[PDB]
Short mmCIF file of C-alpha atoms and ligand atoms in Angstrom, two decimals:
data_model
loop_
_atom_site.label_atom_id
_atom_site.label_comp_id
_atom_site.label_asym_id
_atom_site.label_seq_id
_atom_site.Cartn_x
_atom_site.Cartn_y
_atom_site.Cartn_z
CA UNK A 1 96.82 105.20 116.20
CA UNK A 2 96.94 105.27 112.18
CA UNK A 3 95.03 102.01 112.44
CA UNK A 4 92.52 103.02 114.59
CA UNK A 5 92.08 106.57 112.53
CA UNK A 6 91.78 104.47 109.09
CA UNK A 7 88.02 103.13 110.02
CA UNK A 8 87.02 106.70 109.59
CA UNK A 9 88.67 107.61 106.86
CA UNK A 10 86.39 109.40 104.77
CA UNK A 11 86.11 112.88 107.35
CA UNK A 12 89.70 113.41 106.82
CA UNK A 13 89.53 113.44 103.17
CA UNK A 14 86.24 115.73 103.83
CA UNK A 15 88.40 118.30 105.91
CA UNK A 16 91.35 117.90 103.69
CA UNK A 17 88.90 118.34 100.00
CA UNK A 18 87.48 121.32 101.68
CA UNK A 19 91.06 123.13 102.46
CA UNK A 20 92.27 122.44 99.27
CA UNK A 21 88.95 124.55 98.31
CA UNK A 22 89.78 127.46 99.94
CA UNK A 23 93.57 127.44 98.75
CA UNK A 24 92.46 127.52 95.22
CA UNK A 25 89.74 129.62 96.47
CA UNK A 26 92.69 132.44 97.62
CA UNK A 27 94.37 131.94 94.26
CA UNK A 28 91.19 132.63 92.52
CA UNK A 29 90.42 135.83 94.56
CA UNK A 30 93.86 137.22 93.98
CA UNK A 31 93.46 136.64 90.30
CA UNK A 32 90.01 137.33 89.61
CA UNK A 33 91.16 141.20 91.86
CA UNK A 34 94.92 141.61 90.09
CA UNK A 35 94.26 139.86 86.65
CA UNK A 36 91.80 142.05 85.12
CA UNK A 37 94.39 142.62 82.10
CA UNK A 38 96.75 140.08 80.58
CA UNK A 39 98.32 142.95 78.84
CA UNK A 40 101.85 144.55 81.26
CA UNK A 41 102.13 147.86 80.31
CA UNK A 42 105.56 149.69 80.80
CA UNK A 43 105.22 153.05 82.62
CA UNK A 44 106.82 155.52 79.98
CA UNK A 45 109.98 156.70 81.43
CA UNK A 46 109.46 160.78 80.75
CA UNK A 47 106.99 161.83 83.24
CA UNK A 48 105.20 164.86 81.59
CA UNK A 49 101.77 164.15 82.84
CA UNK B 1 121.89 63.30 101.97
CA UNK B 2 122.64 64.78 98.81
CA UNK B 3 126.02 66.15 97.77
CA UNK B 4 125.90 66.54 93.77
CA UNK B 5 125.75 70.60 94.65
CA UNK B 6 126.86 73.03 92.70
CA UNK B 7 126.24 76.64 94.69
CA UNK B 8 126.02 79.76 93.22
CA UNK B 9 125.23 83.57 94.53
CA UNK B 10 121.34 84.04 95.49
CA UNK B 11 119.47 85.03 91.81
CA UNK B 12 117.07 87.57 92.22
CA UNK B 13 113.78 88.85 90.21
CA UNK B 14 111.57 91.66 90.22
CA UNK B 15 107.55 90.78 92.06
CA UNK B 16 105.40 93.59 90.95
CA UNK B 17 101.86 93.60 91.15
CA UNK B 18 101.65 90.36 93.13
CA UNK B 19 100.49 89.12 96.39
CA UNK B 20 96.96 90.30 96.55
CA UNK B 21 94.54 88.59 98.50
CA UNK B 22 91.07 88.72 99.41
CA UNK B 23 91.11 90.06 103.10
CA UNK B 24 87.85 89.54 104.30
CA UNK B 25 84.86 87.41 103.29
CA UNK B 26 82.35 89.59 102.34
CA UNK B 27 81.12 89.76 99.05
CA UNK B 28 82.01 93.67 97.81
CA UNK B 29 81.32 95.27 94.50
CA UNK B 30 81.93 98.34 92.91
CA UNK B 31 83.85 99.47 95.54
CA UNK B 32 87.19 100.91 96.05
CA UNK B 33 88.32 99.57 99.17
CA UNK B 34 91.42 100.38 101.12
CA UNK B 35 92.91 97.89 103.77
CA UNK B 36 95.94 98.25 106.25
CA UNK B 37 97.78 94.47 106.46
CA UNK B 38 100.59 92.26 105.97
CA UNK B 39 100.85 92.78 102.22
CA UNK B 40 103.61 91.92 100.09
CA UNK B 41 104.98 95.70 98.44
CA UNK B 42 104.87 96.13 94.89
C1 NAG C 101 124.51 63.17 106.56
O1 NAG C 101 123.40 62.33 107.17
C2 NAG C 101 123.39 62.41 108.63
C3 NAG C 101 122.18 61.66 109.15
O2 NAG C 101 121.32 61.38 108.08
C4 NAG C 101 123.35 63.85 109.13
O3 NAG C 101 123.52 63.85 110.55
C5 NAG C 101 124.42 64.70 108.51
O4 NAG C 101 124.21 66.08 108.89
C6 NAG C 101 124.42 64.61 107.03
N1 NAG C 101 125.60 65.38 106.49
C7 NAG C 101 125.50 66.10 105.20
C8 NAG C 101 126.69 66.86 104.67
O5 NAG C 101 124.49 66.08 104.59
#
């Protein structure tokens, strides 16, 4: 059945180059939302606020 | 027959990057084609 599949060939690399889009896509939209500062500041620990 | 033998253990040698052939006869260019066959590993 691999045989037979290879004449098409190029619409599985299609569906596969278009989910490995929208994985990186998810991994951009999680870091373009939680990312906004490269900078991890420490709560304070005395919590007179 | 021929008995001036001397035997010894089967040598061996590394084959990489050989047995390639042509396997069609189309004229192709600038392509990258891929092929499914008997083809001898690298
Ligand atoms: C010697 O020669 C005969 C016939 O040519 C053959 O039957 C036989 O197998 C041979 N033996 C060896 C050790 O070559």
């Amino acid at each position: 059945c691999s045989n037979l599949l290879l004449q098409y060939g190029s619409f599985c690399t299609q569906l596969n180059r278009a989910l490995t889009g929208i994985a990186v896509e998810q991994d951009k939209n999680t870091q373009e939302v939680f990312a906004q500062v490269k900078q991890i500041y420490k709560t304070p620990p005395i919590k007179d606020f | 027959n021929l008995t001036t033998r001397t035997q010894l253990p089967p040598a061996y040698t590394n084959s990489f990057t050989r047995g390639v052939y042509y396997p069609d006869k189309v004229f192709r260019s600038s392509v990258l084609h891929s092929t499914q066959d008997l083809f001898l590993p690298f």
